[PDB]
């Protein structure tokens, strides 16, 4: 054809400063095509090229976008290179906020006690967030848990729970060996979506 | 207070209903809401500013755009309803919306005064040299 | 402040203009402006509560009264001009009347939305998260 | 005649904590004739007899209206009797409050000090006043005083001085033998009229 296509759509997917920038690929791509991803701060009328060219479907953008939690986030957008023809910009429907991150927990931890089982949710810890940028920090209140118990040996089901904090307990029956737990946060105040932990067991 | 996290998640999820309506038809990048505005929040003439800022989405903002775009119409309603429902429990708590919260020394004496009909009147002038003096009281506690 | 002792005065001088026209036509003998006001006035709900008694007395009072009584009209109503000018240096005076001060930031992003038309509408609504978000720090700060 | 007439005036003349009441007298008064006098508090319907008969024609009200500085005043009224008949009451044109109290000064002192004349102007301190209920306290601010100077020996003229504080300063010119002054006072807040000091030598 005459010009390069563009990538039909371009959207995030992030954790707590784990900003990747995703896009589905044009049609027909060649192995020589690539594509350029910029940044726009929301606030100043101005992009800026991330990467030159990028053999992938998707990019890290949390080295630029690490002021996401004190801003009023950014725009994000992609277009396929291939020689020294290129496609139209394909920019992020929406205006990436913390609102587009999705909760996690950074851990969980199980201790046997008295006659009950203590859990302590672990939040997220990731390595360039800024010192001061603390999970804690940016969602000060309201921080809530959704928990799921499983039972083994036995089948494959759970037990729902809610909590409002980092830590809960859940009084044990005797009966039951091993008990294995997984957690969902959220934030009361948000509608943020949460992603369910990796299980936990004793 | 009572409920307000909640309040607010209604408001959020009100708007991801419409989130992505508006932000594909904005293509300029510029910041409306200057952090300006955010400061007044932060400043004594803040409850004013709340109050102006609901005001003018309500009156000005949401109405024209409803009336502009039919399909989200109903949406941008129901938003708009949620931020009603906001404002109510926000000077229902005091410490958020006072300057939205009539006297109600002022809606008693009113109605003192107009069952006194044209008694009324005379009563009202006569006693301005109290009102002059609670004026006066009033600013002393500055 | 400025000159409040005048004008408090001047409100005074006013008065005795027509203090005994009116005070020989009432009799009865309660308190109209119970000391309830008073106290209204110093708590946090004061300004609200002395707004609504100016704009009582402008607006149904006084009003009333000049047009019940034309021998006293001219001497009610230049009381009342007295008034509106001991408003205007009360809210000029932030301490005192906040309740009646608009916003400044909502006034100058009122412009830049208007000076964007029916792009405007758009701006506004997709900046409605950002909205929230201020409602949301305001909160916090109480 | 008929019916006893009744006082065609009533009003009040107050000093600091000198609530004096008066009136004028009905016309071809007997001397077994006196007058009733009655007080009413602003905020309570119902008038109290003060005197069931007095053969003046003022009355000391103070004792009674003690907290005229913390209330919203008074209404006082008067109505001749004469055996077992009376007239109608007659009650003060307005309602007496504080702006109706005219303000005065308890005296003033004069020192000579380097080379200028110091004034002291001490304030009324009545005797029936509340202990708390000081002049300073109930007027707390604004207070102002207009001063008149007349030098002795030398004609009957007066040099006229504003001031802001109870304590003003007058530079001396030396020619001058002795000095009279008088203090006027007022609250820059208030119309209160003021009454002229006596004069003050030195």
Same mark, same amino acid.
């Given at each position: 054809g005459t010009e390069l296509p563009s990538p039909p759509s371009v959207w995030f997917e992030a954790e707590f400063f784990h900003h990747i920038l995703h896009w589905t690929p044009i049609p027909?791509? $060649? &192995?020589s095509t690539c594509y350029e991803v910029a940044l726009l701060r929301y606030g100043i009328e101005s992009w800026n090229s991330? @990467?030159?060219? $990028?053999?992938? =479907? @998707?990019?890290? =953008?949390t080295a630029v976008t690490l002021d996401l939690y004190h801003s009023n986030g950014y725009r994000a957008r992609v277009r396929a290179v291939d020689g020294s023809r290129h496609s139209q910009w394909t920019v992020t429907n929406t205006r990436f906020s913390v609102d587009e991150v999705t909760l996690t927990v950074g851990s969980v931890n199980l201790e046997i006690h008295n006659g009950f089982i203590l859990g302590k949710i672990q939040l997220p810890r990731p390595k360039?967030?800024?010192?001061?940028?603390?999970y804690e920090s940016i969602f $000060?209140?309201?921080?809530e848990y959704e928990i799921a118990i499983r039972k083994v040996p036995g089948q494959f089901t759970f037990t729902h729970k809610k909590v409002k904090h980092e830590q809960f307990s859940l009084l044990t @029956?005797? &009966?039951?060996?091993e008990f294995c737990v997984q957690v969902k946060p959220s934030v009361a105040s948000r509608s943020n979506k949460g992603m369910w932990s990796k299980e936990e067991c004793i | 207070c009572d409920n307000f996290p909640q309040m607010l998640r209604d408001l959020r999820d009100a708007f991801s209903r419409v989130k992505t309506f508006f932000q594909t038809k904005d293509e300029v990048d510029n +910041? +409306? +809401?200057?952090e300006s505005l955010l400061e007044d929040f932060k400043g004594y003439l803040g409850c004013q500013a709340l109050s102006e800022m609901i005001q003018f989405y309500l009156e000005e903002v949401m109405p024209q755009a409803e009336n502009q775009d039919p399909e989200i119409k109903d949406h941008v309603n129901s938003l708009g309803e949620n931020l009603k429902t906001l404002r109510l429990r926000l000077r229902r708590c005091h410490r958020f919306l006072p300057c939205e919260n009539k006297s109600k020394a002022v809606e008693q004496i009113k109605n003192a005064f107009n069952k006194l009909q044209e008694k009324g009147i005379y009563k009202a002038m006569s006693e301005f040299d109290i009102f002059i003096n609670y004026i006066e009281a009033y600013m002393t506690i500055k």
């Open positions: 027909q791509q $060649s &192995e991330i @990467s030159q060219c $990028s053999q992938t =479907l @998707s990019y890290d =953008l360039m967030a800024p010192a001061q940028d603390t $000060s209140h309201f921080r @029956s005797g &009966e039951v060996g | +910041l +409306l +809401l200057k």
